Each structure stands twice: as structure tokens, then as C-alpha cells.
């Protein structure tokens, strides 16, 4: 019998997701790694318990997370049953379909066949009646967006998803999805782009403007650029020199490199949340302290950008 | 085996709820207090049985009623199983979501997540396939009403609620909710404001007009002003003085103070029902007698208001 | 094990119901009487089996048929399970709600509460997943027809009724229900009025114009005027009886019983989809279906029939 | 325990169905014959396993396939449970209602009663929660198309079919069905007409254009004209011209059947051809039609002349 920390909601910051009434914690837990069959369940159990004890109420999955595919959803489902039976209505659970999941022409893409069959598979693996958010995981240029939208719509109408999201859609395609969903009287809840210090496509492309204009939230995937924006590597000598200079700016702020990278994303109120792909419980404890310093000077932002340019860190 | 009073429908007055074809008893039972795990089930049983024997067919609940939260729904569900198994289709059962119910950001307010997870919890606690009326229990300024309305609409489309209501919404927000639900071809059935002799926000604000203009019914919550209108207290000296003068008017009518307060709400067609929160069976027998004198003269209505103004009883 | 007549579809006439693709037998069986707990089930069984062996595929019920109320549905459900388990998809089963069924304010009228609670009760009594036609049984002036229509629409969308009907609605109210159901993209299937030789409200009112203009079928209730148009009575006046005697003489000249002529008269053209026969024994069905052998009337005969009705004051 | 061929997706060609995102294999398996209660289940099993091993992921049924009616659905359902329990999400399974299925006024045609009762029967026989495509199997001139379309829409909204199709509808009635389903926000996925070298109503009539303009797929039923466009073989004149067509196939390095299938698949106007195989080896043979999908103008003219001259229509 496990009792979550009674003070779990006392320190975490929650942000409304776009124009919706749904509040996400400013850091959410992603299950892309660390939750497959290659990872001991004991380590997974410690990560989920620590996340919820820190107030992290959103756990982001996809059909193909593991490895092998599906196994993150299976393991999460087991841990939900063991440790979170009383707490499911305090959690926001997502999953997704769009990348390669199972073999053959219906195991990938944006088709109604793949999306609705995959959703049914994910619900069965996780042992849930519904997910809080179902995403289209990526753009399928070969399926008309009307088909994809109408599948997202069916998942909501049929009670298998409370809300729907998209991931890695351009501003123009985001706009079209919002309009198509509005035909079914469903607001697009949320967009999940890759977004961090080193990958600024969402600001350059004007995605953040499209999202605010349509009241859609934004949750940053790979906010730590897969370990580049942590202590980890402290590729080219110029890259590393600029990473060292960024780490010095973080130290000036009393922050770790990772904390500053997360604070940097959470400086825009147009970012709803940042997805932390934590591999041990201590990482969550350290990352959430980013919330202690969310302001940057003009000079700081200019210097950050200048170090990124110098080191050619825009990969 | 319990057999309800065969004459239960013979005396109660029923009112159509706004423009709808649903008839509510002019007095309904509210379960805000008295039905928690802190109250013995035998006392609850005797209240529910008496209410139905008097023709009271509408039982009003909300997710957080108890204490603790959820326990009034649980206890009601047990009693429905034990005593009302043959009668469920003779009852109108409501519940609601909006106030704090469970910890964290999804346990309060107007979101789709909270309303729909809460409704599922309530149906499970009560052992019901659906409720007859599902409410948004209060305004959430931080959820768009489009979202709250769509969640109510989903509850109806999916067969978990027959009708929908709102509680404590301004006239402007109530109008907007009527419009938003009409986009789903669902009429807003009912609004549950606080309304009694001493608190007439619904009238001054224009809400009663908004409800009639849209065919929405009105069920008065705290019609006895939480004891102020029962002579429980017979507060400033001028308050107390005006309460005693009100009680004298009641006595001139052959009524208790509680009975006059209820008759006053029921004096015309602007109120569908008044929600009585009984702690014992006898209170119900006494309150339903209000129906024997629903008439007030112009002079009586003026003198009531004068006493209230004089005592600053607003 | 009971095997229905292999030749059952060979002689019955079927009529498309209004503009729809649903074909009703020109004679249907109604369970208004003879199917209550006051009637032995062996008698009921003989009636249903005979009906179906004659090609009568439409069995018309209502929540309150018995007595007591609901017992016709229960008895029918038992016989369906015992004798018609392989034949349900060959049957058109209807039920209704609108008259007094259970005590109190939700047990009568047109409200969404009553209609939807009642349809659940009926499906449980009959042991069916759905009925083929669900009716509003009568007008409720105190429920808006938008509420009654929405209730019927919900029965269809939820899969508990394939089609919907109304009974005893005026032309103007019929037209409104058609428009209201069309907002849900549902056509009104059918109208069940009382209609027979002695009761021509449907003609005189304009109902038959409304039904044709909107493609709604018409199923005649009490086509034998509760025994007035049979052998039974040959309180009624001497003038009434004299005219009924002369009508029976007309029937005999056509080689028909009075009941057969009364049924042929309704079915003489395409304004009536079916006539509801309320048989109390198997033989009655055999006799009534033979009305189909003579559906033609001359202009002189029609005028003569009306004259005897006027002379005898039989309206 | 049966393990499908790991290389099954490596050679088959898949075509997007109309404007949709659903990819059908260029050859699909039809179960019109060979899957009845008159056919041993071991032979059916070998056929379905071979199909899937070749990458044929679409299996096309209808209520009344057998004989007796319903039996193809029942047998396919058994083989799905035995051999394809892990693979159902890789399959596209259709069924249909429209022709004579059961006795009486509700057992044929286009009515909501028939289509929805029939789909429930088909799901039960097959042991499926839903089919991937549900068809109206033929035109019913006595049911308003609004009724048929609404019943197809209900099958989709209720989760009993992912997509909807029609079969043997004129271009005018096709166009009407597309419009009616669009009122329900459902795209017509696919049309299944009879189409082969000897039967070109779909081209003559304007249908292929109607399908193209509305983004609807086209799957050819009886692509081998019921054995006429194979080795198998009614007049002396007919037989003469079938001999000559066979020579043209031999020039291309094809059997008559391979050429007849290549001819349908020669351009993008056909999504798939429905093969009704009676033994596994036929499928191995027919799939090689994909090796040669090109025809010169001279071949195309010569084919047509042999058919003209032989009376083959
Ligand atoms: Mg696994
Ligand atoms: Mg364990
Ligand atoms: Mg007990
Ligand atoms: Mg028996
Ligand atoms: Mg076997």
C-alpha cells in the first residue's frame, strides 16, 4: 500500500493548456526511454512515484515507446494498477500513433485504420478505459488531414480520449487540423514539438504564434536536447567550447545546465510544459528546481544565442 | 420489503420545469447535509422514505456532499438498492461537479477532465446507469464555457445524464450556456441559485427573467436561509427585530416562519421547486404544508419587504 | 423445435412504408388485447405462430398492453425466446410510450424521462437489444415536441430503435415532428391513426395529405371499429343496426364477410400501408388475410357504402 | 502456432485507396467461392496463409458467400481465431449486404433494417468487433439512397465498420452516395464493380471518372471473367479469340491470367483486383502480374481487336 506525498500539490507550478481549462504541471514525465522491457520494473516504479510526489500529474506515452514497442504502455499499466489505483483521476495520461508500430501498411502513418486500431491496442496495454489525450504523433503527407481529424474526433466521441493533440505539425498543417476539428466541435488541445535551446524551429516557423492564436497548448519534447543541455558532455571542440560557456551562464544564475535549459523554455507563457525523460528519481528532484528561476535578462538571452551561433550548436 | 404510500401522488403539487415536459415536486429533497458517513443510515432511511411517501420525487445530490465527500452519494446508492429498487423510474436524481472534490488540478472547477471523471465517480458511488440531471455546480472563470458545455453535452449524448443543469451562474453566463448547449441541440433544463426571502440576487440581477426567457426552470437552494427563516434564532438587534416581525406575519397566516418562507418562493410561477434539507422525517411533513397557503396580498408582500429593509436583513 | 411455414412469404402482400425501404405486411398483428397475464400463454402462442406462418412479420406492442401493463411485452418476449429465436431478423417489432404506464409524473406523457426510461423497460421486458419501431403513443400538449423528438432521436442514435413512429398526432403536429426529426437527419417512418370505415378523421383532417407529402407510412389502428365492422353486433340504435345490416349485405354480394370488406376498404389504394388486426384466435387471422382476395371497389359501391353510413348516422 | 512469412511486405505493391490514407494490396483475396461448408477447411487455411505470406492483406467477404449463405464468414472467422489472432490489425476485412441472404422482406435489398441486422449477423459469424469496410452490395431502387446511406453512416458512428463502400452502383448513384455520406462527414472509401478485359462498363459508363473526381477507390471484381481469361478453356469463335489473346500473353512472358490482371493494374485507375483463388499456387502465379504492368498502344489496340472479332462481351 503506497500513500503519495500529501504535499505533492504544494510547490509544483501548473499552467493552463492553451485556452482550455486543463492545467498541466510545468514539468511532465515522458516515457520515451526507461520504461521498456529492457528496464527493471523496480527502477520504473521509483520514477513514477517520485514524479507524482513532486506534483507531476502528466505522464506522456506513445504506442511504440519501449523497447520493444508497446512495452512502456504495458509497464505503465502494471504500475498504474499496483500503485495508482486510487489516483487515476489525478493523472493526465497521453498516448499517440503515427510512427512505425507494427509491420505492414496499417502499422504506421495517419490513417483511420491505424489510429483507431492503435488506440484500442494502447488502451488494452495500459488497462485504461480512456486516455486523457490522444495524439496524432507525426504528419502523414499521404493521408488527407480530414481522415486523421475524423479519427481523432471518433476517439473523443466514443469516450476513448478526453482530448486530442498533434505532434510535429507545421504551423500551416496545425492551422488546418484546428479547423477540421472545429467542424466536429472539438478544440485541438495541445501541440507537442521538439523544442529546446538548440532547436528553435517552433519560434522561427512561427508555430508559437499559430498555437496562441488558436488557444492550443505547447509541450516541449527533448527540452534537454538528449543530454546535450546537461552536465553530460562537459561533438566538435567548438560545440563543446560553447556548451562550456552556456554552463558558465547557468552557474552565474545558481543553476545547473539542465535547470537553465528548462527555465529558458518556461520563460514564455506560450510553453505549457516541458517533457522530462527522467532515468532516475534524483533527476526529477533536480530538474523541478528550474521553477525557482524563470527570468532572464535581455543581455542573458543575447549571450545565450551568441554562444549557440559561435559553437554552431544549431543541429 | 418496503411498500411506498399508495396515495403519495395525491397531494403534492408538481410544476413543469421551465418549458420542458419534466414535472418536479414543488418541494424537493436536498442531501447537502445529513447523508454522510457521520450520520446513521437508519435516520437517512427514514428521511428518504418519508419524502417519497409525501410525493417528493426529486433527490438532489452533488459529488462532494457528506461529509466526507462522496458519502451522500454512496449512502443514497445503498438506500436506493435496499428500498427503491422498484421505484427508480419514479425518481429524479441529480448530481453535480464544480466545487473541490478531490486533490490537485483536476479535482475542482469546470474542465472536461473533472466533469466527466467526476460524473463517472458519482454513477459508480450511486450504483446508477445515469442521473436524471447532471449540473455544473459553479462557474469556473478559468475554463471556457464552450468546454464545460461540451462536457455536459457529452454526458447526455453518452446516456449518463438525461438532462443538464447549472448552479450559481450569472444571467449573462446562463444565457451563454443556453446558447452553447443549443449548438448541441440540448436545452438547458434548470438553474439552481441560492434564493430565499432574504437573498434576492436572482431577481435584482435579472436572472429570473433570463430563466423564463429561455424556458429554464429554477430550483431554490437554501430557501430557509440556513435557519434564519425558521425562527431557530427567535445577528444584530435590528436583524432579530425584523425576524420576529416576519414571524408574526407568518402566525397571522396560520403558518410557521419556515412555511411562510417556502410559500413565498412558491407564490407564483417564477420558481419550479424549493430544495429542503431535512434532518428528520417530521420536518418534511411540516414543510410540505406550505402548499396549503401560497397566496400573498399586495399589502403582505409590501410589509414583508419593509420589515426586511428596516432590519437590514439582506 | 418449431419450424415456421416454408411457404409463409408466398401469398401475403407487402407494402413499402411511405418513402422508406421497409415493407410491412398489409395486415399486421396488434397485441393490444389477448396477450396479458389474464390470457393463457398457449392461446397467445397459437396466435403468433399462425400470424408468422401467414407472412405477418409485424407485431405491434406498447408499454401498457396487457392487462396488467407491460405483460404483453413480457409474454411476447417469452414466446420470442421459445419459438422465434431463429426468426427475430424476419420480424418488425414495435413498441410505444405516451399513455399511463406507471404511477407518478414520469409514468405518462411525452417527456425525455418517460420515453427513454420506458423504452429501457420495454427492451428488458421483451428481451430485445432494440425494437424496429419506437413510437410516441400520443400527443402530450405539455411537453415541447422538440423534447419528444430529441428523445426519439436518441433512441435511434443509441441503437435501441431502428426507426421511429408517432400515433394520433394531428396533421400540423405530424408535420412539426417530421421537421424536428429531420434536424437529426432521421425521417419519421410511420403514423398510426385510428382509421376505419366509420372513422375518417384521417381523411377529413388532411392527415393523409401530410403523410403523402412527407413520405410517412400509415398503419390503421382499430380497422374493425372494435367489432362494429364484423359479425358481432348484427349502445347501438335501431338506425345504426339497420345500416350495419345493409353494409353486411354489400359485403356478402362481394363474396366477403363484413370484416373482410372493412379491411379491403382500407387497403383499396396505397394510402394505407397496413391494417392492425387484433386477433383473439388463430382462425380470425386466416379469415382476415383473405381480404387481400378482393381489394377493388367500384365508384358506385364506394358511394353506396358512404350513403349507408350517413343514413345510419354511423360516424 | 503459425508464424507468417517475415518477408511478406517486401514484394507486394500497395496502392492508396482513392484519396484516403488506406493502402490496399494491388491483389486482394475474394471469398466468393471456395470458403463454404462445401469446401474442406484445410484447403481454405492453405489459401489464407499463402495470401498473407504474399503480402495480401485484404480479404473480401459478403453475407451470402458460401454455400450455404454465411458459411464463408463463419469459416473465415474460425481461421482468423486459429491462425490470425495476432495479425487482425494487419488485415483489411470487408463484408456486404444487399443481395438475397435470408427469407422474407427484410433479407434482401437496401433498407436500414436489412443492412444493420445483417452487419450484426456478419460480425457474429466472423467473431469481429468491426469490419474494416462495410458495403451496400447492390443498388436497391425501392429504398431511398438517404436510408441506405444513413445505415452505412450508423455502422461507422457505432464503431462496427471503419469505412464504407458500395458495389455496382451507376455513376449517377455513386455520385449521390458520395454526397449523402458527406452530410454525415464520411468519405465513400471504395466502389467494387465487375471489371475485366471482357467487361468494360466501368470505363464506357463514366464510372472511373466519377470515382477519380470524388477520390473514391476502385476494386475490380471477377478480374479474370470467371475463368475465361485464364488457361481453363463457349463458342468456336470465342475460343478462337481466347487463343489469340493467350498468344499475346505468351509474347509478354505471361499466362493469360497474368496479362488480364496486369491489364487492370496497368495504370492508377484501379486500386486492386480481387482474386478468387481455389488453391495456394494460384496466388503465387497471379501475383507475378506485378512484374509486367506496361502495355504499348499497339498491344492495347490488338487486345481490343481480338475481343471485338471474337464476340467477347
Ligand atoms: Mg510486450
Ligand atoms: Mg508486482
Ligand atoms: Mg442494510
Ligand atoms: Mg414454456
Ligand atoms: Mg481447428
Residue numbers in the entry:
A (entry chain D): 2 to 235, 259 to 339
B (entry chain A): 2 to 235, 259 to 338
C (entry chain B): 2 to 235, 258 to 338
D (entry chain C): 2 to 234, 259 to 338
What does the article say, verbatim?
In all, we determined 23 structures, four of them not deposited in the protein data bank. These novel structures represent enzymes involved in stress response, specifically methylglyoxal reductase (YghZ), as well as three enzymes important in core metabolic functions, phosphoglucose isomerase (pGI), 6-phospho-beta-glucosidase (BglA), and glutamate dehydrogenase (GDH). All the proteins are oligomeric (YghZ, pGI, BglA, GDH) and belong to three different fold families. YghZ and BglA have a classic TIM barrel structure, pGI adopts an alpha/beta fold, and GDH possesses a core Rossmann fold found in many nucleotide binding proteins. Based on these experiments, we demonstrate successful structural characterization of multiple proteins using only microgram quantities of purified material.
The aldo-ketoreductases, of which YghZ is a member, are a large family of NADPH-dependent oxidoreductases that have the function of reducing various aldehydes and ketones. The YghZ enzyme likely functions as a methylglyoxal reductase and is known to convert the toxic metabolite methylglyoxal to acetol in vitro and in vivo. As in the larger family of aldo-keto reductases, YghZ, has a central TIM barrel domain and a smaller, mostly helical domain. YghZ is a distant homolog (<40% sequence identity) of mammalian aflatoxin dialdehyde reductases of the aldo-keto reductase AKR7 family and to potassium channel β-subunits in the AKR6 family, the structure of which was used for molecular replacement. Based on sequence alignments and structural alignments with other aldo-keto reductases, likely catalytic residues were identified in our study. Four amino acids (Tyr-66, His-138, Lys-97 and Asp-61) form a putative catalytic tetrad in the active site. Although some extra electron density was noted in the active site, the density was too diffuse to reliably model the dinucleotide cofactor or substrate/product molecules. In addition, proteins involved in stress response such as methylglyoxal reductase (YghZ) and heat shock protein 31 (HSP31) were crystallized. While these proteins are likely constitutively present at low levels under optimum growth conditions, the high cell density present during fermentor growth may lead to the induction of a stress response even when controlling for pH and aeration of the fermentor media.
